[PDB]
Amino acid sequence: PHEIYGSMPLEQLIPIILRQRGPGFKFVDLNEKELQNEIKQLGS
Amino acid sequence: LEILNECHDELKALPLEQVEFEKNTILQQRSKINSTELLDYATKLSKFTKIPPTFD
Amino acid sequence: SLYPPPPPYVKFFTQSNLEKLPKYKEKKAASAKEEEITCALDYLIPPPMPKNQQYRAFGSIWQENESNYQYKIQELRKLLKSLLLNYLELIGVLSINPDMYERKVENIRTILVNIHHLLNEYRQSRESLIMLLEEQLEYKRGEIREIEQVCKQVHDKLTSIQDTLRTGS
Amino acid sequence: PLPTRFEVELEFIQSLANIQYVTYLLTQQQIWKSPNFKNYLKYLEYWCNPPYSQCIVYPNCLFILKLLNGFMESALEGLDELPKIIQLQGPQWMNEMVERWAN
Amino acid sequence: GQALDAVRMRLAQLTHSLRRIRDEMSKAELPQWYTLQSQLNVTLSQLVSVTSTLQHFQETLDSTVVYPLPKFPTTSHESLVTTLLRKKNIPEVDEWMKYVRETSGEEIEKLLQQDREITNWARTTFRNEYGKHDFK
Amino acid sequence: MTDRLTQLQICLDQMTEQFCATLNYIDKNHGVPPEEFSNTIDELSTDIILKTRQINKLIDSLPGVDVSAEEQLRKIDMLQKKLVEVEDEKIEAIKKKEKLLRHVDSLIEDFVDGIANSKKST
Amino acid sequence: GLILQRLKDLNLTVSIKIALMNIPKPLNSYHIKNGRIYFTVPNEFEIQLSTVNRQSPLFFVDLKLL
Amino acid sequence: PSYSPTSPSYSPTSPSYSPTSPSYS
């Protein structure tokens, strides 16, 4: 599963992140502290 | 700094963990299945999958 | 009709039968401690493999580290030479007394047929496995070697830059 | 002699690969309406493992039934699009079958 | 050919009206109710005219015999030929009138004449009722 | 690439077709001038001889033509073994390459921060 | 997965790009975070910017009023 | 002249409902 995520260039990853986060939320609005936060919840 | 940055980018482009899971999956998939059944099935599909040149 | 009807037992198994299958198989196993169809739930029990390990269909029968061949080679060479010799003798028959030519024709074919038999024992799946083996092996070696080549050239460039900046100090 | 249930179920599975057979089966209302047929379809899923998979003649139906499996949560509707979609997606589905088996 | 030509032009204008009502319904915003009524009535009366004209010239349509062109290639266009050739109804309408006949279900003939007399009696009764009160 | 077994089948089919064509020419031409007929038949016989020699040079060139399949079995088994070790070695190779890569990234970041706070120090 | 180092590279690219250009003294207050650069002029505004490529120029991302 | 032609409204995706039954000999 992670093979596709790790094998795609950022030029195609950006639209994927944009569609995952929905409209309005830019690809850069994500916070690193917030990022490690949801990483912590998903790791549980 | 620029040129070493593209060197870093191109090195990162060539793959880490994903390749080793894929190699693992290959190894247990190969170990699980015996070659006898695979060769028998290949021989039995050789007639169907391969279109002979004389089949009008 | 053009399309044969669905199998009959298909219609016997509802959702209730599926959900009651565990207790049914438990009861069947407890009681047990060609299968007769005494209950409608018998078919969900996996069918047993035939003891003969054979299956018949349409008049035809069906049933380790890869998971004197010189005698066959010389037999094939002598068979090819004899086939050429018999072709020459048969065309000579056509030349002089063609009326009985067929008397040899099928004979030659038998040798050709034997050639097909000589192919049967030589049957090639392992050889295909070998050829695929070396092609992906050499492809991965090429990829690997270009990887260390490119990383080594990047490291050499980095060392050259380090020397250049040290000289400018 | 009377064929065993092995033979008839295997022949049904291998005949499921035909697009015409699938279109005809889905044409009738009561075939899809009756839960018995879909229950049998889910029962047939256990042939994707050996040594049963060694006895198949056409591996394409292996995905088709699985595709038919998807049909229970995708809807009948889509019956018209079935021939076009199978013709269009034959390449990649054959490729994934080859990846599952040939590798 | 004249009858089929008239059928062609009328059905073409009917299809044009259908395309119209389609591309004014496909908009994300619904127009005013009155425009929808006007389009509905015009297209529906046009369908009535289609039915009436098709009724008028049944003999010309029946007399015609269908035959593919010698120049038309069937080897490459057999799918297109079969597309127009097929005529079986859509299934849902089929079981629709099957359930309709199921619900409906010398005796039949005398019920038929009883329906005749009820129809005539009701017509006469409403004529009398209309004549009873001056509507002008 | 084309497998030599497929080439062998193509060669034998071409040989059969060549014999059929030669005998058809003989059957439909016996009676054409004798000199032209003899020259054409000499060409056909040279073709027969050459086809025979590609048959001979392909049949003896089949790896494993004179090698028993069981030592192929061991060689294939040890090939998958040494393969397992070679992707293992590639795993350590790539992980240490990534290690030096983000050492380089860390020094890049430190140098960039030094540049930034030096040029904003005045 | 890849998002963390992508954002770090975006931050590095933004930092080097702003090092390329001589920022004004009133804009000396800048922050780098999450592939974004923040310029907060007090009682005036807070502008957040980013870039896609090192050669590509900066583009507007977000703005807040003070 | 002709104000506008009709848009192509072909429906090849239509599955058709041809009854097939006299196949057995």
Side-chain angles (χ1 to χ4, degrees):
Chain A
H2 196 276
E3 55 199 59
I4 305 301
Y5 289 102
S7 62
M8 295 298 102
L10 61 84
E11 292 85 5
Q12 293 82 17
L13 294 174
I14 292 160
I16 296 300
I17 302 161
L18 281 161
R19 64 105 179 171
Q20 280 168 326
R21 303 278 79 75
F25 197 89
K26 309 154 203 159
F27 42 84
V28 75
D29 307 343
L30 172 43
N31 200 345
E32 179 177 347
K33 301 168 187 170
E34 180 182 56
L35 182 63
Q36 53 92 28
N37 283 316
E38 70 274 15
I39 278 182
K40 288 195 298 295
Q41 288 88 21
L42 65 88
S44 44
Chain B
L1 286 178
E2 295 292 327
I3 62 170
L4 55 87
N5 187 257
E6 292 84 4
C7 284
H8 166 271
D9 292 331
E10 65 93 18
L11 192 153
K12 184 193 172 174
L14 282 72
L16 275 80
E17 65 271 13
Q18 317 92 12
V19 290
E20 55 89 16
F21 323 111
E22 202 273 334
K23 299 289 94 175
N24 197 356
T25 61
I26 295 172
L27 62 83
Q28 70 274 16
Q29 191 56 267
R30 178 70 274 172
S31 76
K32 275 202 299 292
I33 60 175
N34 195 3
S35 71
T36 62
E37 299 173 17
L38 270 72
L39 62 83
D40 186 74
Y41 182 75
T43 61
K44 85 163 55 70
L45 62 84
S46 63
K47 273 81 63 182
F48 292 165
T49 55
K50 165 191 174 182
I51 297 89
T54 59
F55 190 79
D56 198 11
Chain C
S1 178
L2 174 61
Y3 308 85
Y9 54 110
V10 172
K11 80 180 176 299
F12 291 166
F13 293 100
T14 61
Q15 43 274 50
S16 183
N17 299 348
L18 291 188
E19 61 86 20
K20 80 170 69 80
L21 183 62
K23 65 178 72 66
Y24 175 77
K25 68 173 72 68
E26 286 162 357
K27 290 173 185 187
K28 204 169 182 173
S31 290
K33 287 169 184 179
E34 295 179 359
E35 289 189 22
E36 278 194 354
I37 310 149
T38 63
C39 298
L41 290 156
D42 286 319
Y43 306 119
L44 294 174
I45 311 299
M49 187 66 204
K51 297 181 184 176
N52 297 319
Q53 304 181 18
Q54 61 84 31
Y55 278 141
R56 55 105 179 171
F58 314 101
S60 298
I61 191 66
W62 292 271
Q63 298 277 358
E64 309 171 349
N65 280 319
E66 273 163 351
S67 48
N68 63 7
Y69 292 165
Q70 292 78 241
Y71 182 76
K72 276 75 70 177
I73 291 153
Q74 66 93 28
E75 276 273 322
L76 190 43
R77 302 277 61 65
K78 69 101 177 179
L79 274 180
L80 171 65
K81 263 70 170 176
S82 192
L83 159 71
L84 182 59
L85 192 84
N86 296 303
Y87 188 72
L88 164 75
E89 86 177 7
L90 168 67
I91 63 179
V93 175
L94 271 75
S95 159
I96 284 186
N97 59 6
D99 47 353
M100 61 79 71
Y101 87 105
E102 69 273 3
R103 277 193 189 174
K104 286 183 177 180
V105 167
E106 61 86 20
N107 275 349
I108 281 179
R109 300 293 100 82
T110 61
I111 278 178
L112 262 181
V113 171
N114 296 115
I115 297 169
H116 296 105
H117 294 89
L118 201 50
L119 288 170
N120 290 125
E121 295 96 10
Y122 159 71
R123 301 286 102 85
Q124 262 299 103
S125 304
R126 38 209 176 277
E127 273 85 1
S128 306
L129 190 149
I130 297 169
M131 65 184 73
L132 270 295
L133 209 44
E134 74 253 7
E135 62 156 49
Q136 285 85 19
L137 268 293
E138 62 90 19
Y139 182 76
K140 77 176 296 297
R141 267 64 173 170
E143 289 183 302
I144 284 186
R145 72 175 169 88
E146 72 93 13
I147 297 169
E148 69 273 15
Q149 171 60 256
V150 65
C151 65
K152 255 61 178 172
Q153 83 95 20
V154 176
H155 199 73
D156 293 331
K157 188 185 80 171
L158 294 174
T159 53
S160 72
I161 296 169
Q162 152 184 281
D163 301 337
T164 308
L165 60 91
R166 283 285 88 201
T167 47
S169 75
Chain D
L2 296 174
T4 180
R5 183 179 63 83
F6 262 118
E7 194 164 6
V8 297
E9 69 188 352
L10 165 63
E11 287 176 350
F12 182 76
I13 290 172
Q14 74 99 24
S15 75
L16 283 175
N18 189 359
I19 62 170
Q20 312 301 321
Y21 213 80
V22 169
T23 310
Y24 182 76
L25 285 187
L26 212 62
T27 300
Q28 286 90 39
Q29 174 70 251
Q30 63 84 30
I31 295 172
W32 88 261
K33 179 58 196 72
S34 182
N36 290 318
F37 293 98
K38 55 194 91 165
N39 288 338
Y40 182 76
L41 292 174
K42 280 73 176 175
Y43 182 76
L44 286 187
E45 182 36 79
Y46 86 106
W47 278 42
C48 290
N49 63 7
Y52 274 40
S53 295
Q54 206 267 337
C55 313
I56 191 167
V57 60
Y58 292 116
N60 301 350
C61 65
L62 277 176
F63 182 76
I64 301 310
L65 162 71
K66 281 183 176 185
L67 177 61
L68 294 174
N69 288 144
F71 214 80
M72 62 80 71
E73 69 275 16
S74 68
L76 259 181
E77 45 266 18
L79 159 68
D80 63 358
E81 182 36 33
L82 292 182
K84 275 76 65 179
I85 193 66
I86 185 74
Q87 284 152 242
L88 286 167
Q89 299 215 76
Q92 61 255 37
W93 292 352
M94 160 175 186
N95 285 132
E96 76 183 2
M97 295 298 102
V98 164
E99 284 173 0
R100 282 163 200 239
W101 171 79
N103 289 319
Chain E
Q2 184 178 4
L4 197 59
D5 198 65
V7 169
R8 192 278 325 282
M9 61 85 88
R10 180 189 26 72
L11 275 175
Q13 181 55 255
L14 170 81
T15 311
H16 160 254
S17 65
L18 287 163
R19 296 280 99 79
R20 195 61 194 280
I21 189 57
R22 185 263 306 161
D23 64 358
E24 50 252 30
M25 65 183 73
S26 70
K27 295 196 297 293
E29 206 277 335
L30 274 80
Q32 299 180 359
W33 163 30
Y34 181 76
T35 305
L36 303 187
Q37 291 304 289
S38 179
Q39 287 325 288
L40 173 66
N41 285 121
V42 168
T43 304
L44 203 63
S45 73
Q46 185 193 39
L47 196 71
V48 177
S49 174
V50 162
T51 287
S52 64
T53 298
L54 209 68
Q55 180 277 137
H56 183 281
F57 291 111
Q58 71 150 351
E59 65 289 342
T60 312
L61 314 182
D62 293 355
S63 59
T64 318
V65 177
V66 177
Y67 84 101
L69 290 162
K71 49 168 182 175
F72 195 98
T74 53
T75 309
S76 62
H77 300 100
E78 58 89 20
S79 52
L80 181 56
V81 175
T82 51
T83 300
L84 282 179
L85 272 179
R86 280 318 309 184
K87 46 186 194 172
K88 174 55 67 181
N89 292 316
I90 62 170
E92 64 92 15
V93 170
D94 299 335
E95 51 275 7
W96 185 61
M97 73 290 291
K98 299 289 94 175
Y99 322 127
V100 163
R101 284 291 71 51
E102 166 197 5
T103 313
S104 72
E106 50 268 10
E107 173 93 20
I108 320 181
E109 204 73 14
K110 64 90 175 179
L111 276 296
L112 198 147
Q113 278 70 243
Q114 211 265 342
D115 290 9
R116 299 179 182 269
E117 67 93 19
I118 296 170
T119 285
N120 290 318
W121 181 65
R123 192 194 322 104
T124 54
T125 307
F126 282 89
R127 297 314 303 124
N128 290 318
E129 289 287 344
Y130 179 91
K132 278 170 187 176
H133 289 282
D134 181 21
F135 294 114
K136 269 77 179 175
Chain F
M1 61 295 278
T2 318
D3 165 42
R4 74 280 191 190
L5 186 84
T6 55
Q7 287 298 106
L8 188 153
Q9 273 76 244
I10 296 169
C11 282
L12 69 92
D13 293 330
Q14 284 176 355
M15 182 278 288
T16 316
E17 196 269 330
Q18 196 272 344
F19 283 169
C20 296
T22 305
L23 61 83
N24 265 336
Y25 176 83
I26 287 156
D27 189 56
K28 299 287 96 175
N29 285 252
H30 60 61
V32 298
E35 187 174 5
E36 176 192 340
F37 178 69
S38 195
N39 295 335
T40 319
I41 291 298
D42 290 317
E43 296 164 350
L44 287 168
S45 306
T46 315
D47 296 332
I48 293 166
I49 295 176
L50 72 89
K51 290 298 187 292
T52 300
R53 57 104 171 176
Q54 293 84 18
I55 286 172
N56 296 115
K57 76 179 181 68
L58 266 294
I59 193 66
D60 63 358
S61 76
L62 294 175
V65 55
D66 46 354
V67 176
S68 63
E70 69 275 16
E71 59 186 358
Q72 273 87 14
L73 292 168
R74 279 82 65 192
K75 78 160 62 65
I76 281 151
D77 186 74
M78 61 79 71
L79 188 153
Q80 287 70 241
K81 299 289 94 175
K82 64 90 176 179
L83 176 140
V84 165
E85 286 87 5
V86 70
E87 292 84 4
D88 291 331
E89 189 276 332
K90 187 37 74 172
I91 297 169
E92 292 84 4
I94 193 66
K95 71 157 160 271
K96 65 182 181 293
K97 283 185 293 259
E98 292 300 318
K99 282 172 57 56
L100 61 83
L101 196 72
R102 85 291 186 277
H103 294 89
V104 169
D105 296 353
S106 168
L107 57 89
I108 288 157
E109 182 65 26
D110 293 330
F111 179 51
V112 163
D113 299 332
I115 297 169
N117 64 7
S118 63
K119 62 94 175 179
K120 299 289 94 176
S121 294
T122 314
Chain G
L2 305 189
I3 314 170
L4 179 57
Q5 62 266 28
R6 285 313 182 199
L7 285 167
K8 286 171 178 178
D9 178 76
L10 283 176
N11 276 321
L12 169 70
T13 307
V14 166
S15 65
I16 63 171
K17 191 169 188 97
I18 68 157
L20 299 171
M21 183 177 176
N22 63 6
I23 202 70
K25 299 286 99 176
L27 297 177
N28 211 30
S29 67
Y30 64 91
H31 181 85
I32 290 289
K33 201 181 180 175
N34 316 317
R36 265 167 156 177
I37 183 155
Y38 307 149
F39 277 63
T40 312
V41 192
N43 205 7
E44 301 205 7
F45 61 97
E46 170 185 53
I47 186 74
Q48 316 179 356
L49 307 176
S50 196
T51 181
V52 177
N53 185 38
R54 51 193 58 248
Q55 289 88 22
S56 296
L58 293 172
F59 64 97
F60 165 75
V61 170
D62 211 8
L63 192 143
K64 184 184 178 186
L65 292 178
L66 303 182
Chain H
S2 311
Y3 57 97
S4 282
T6 186
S7 297
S9 175
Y10 277 80
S11 177
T13 55
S14 302
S16 173
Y17 316 111
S18 185
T20 304
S21 301
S23 173
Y24 44 100
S25 168

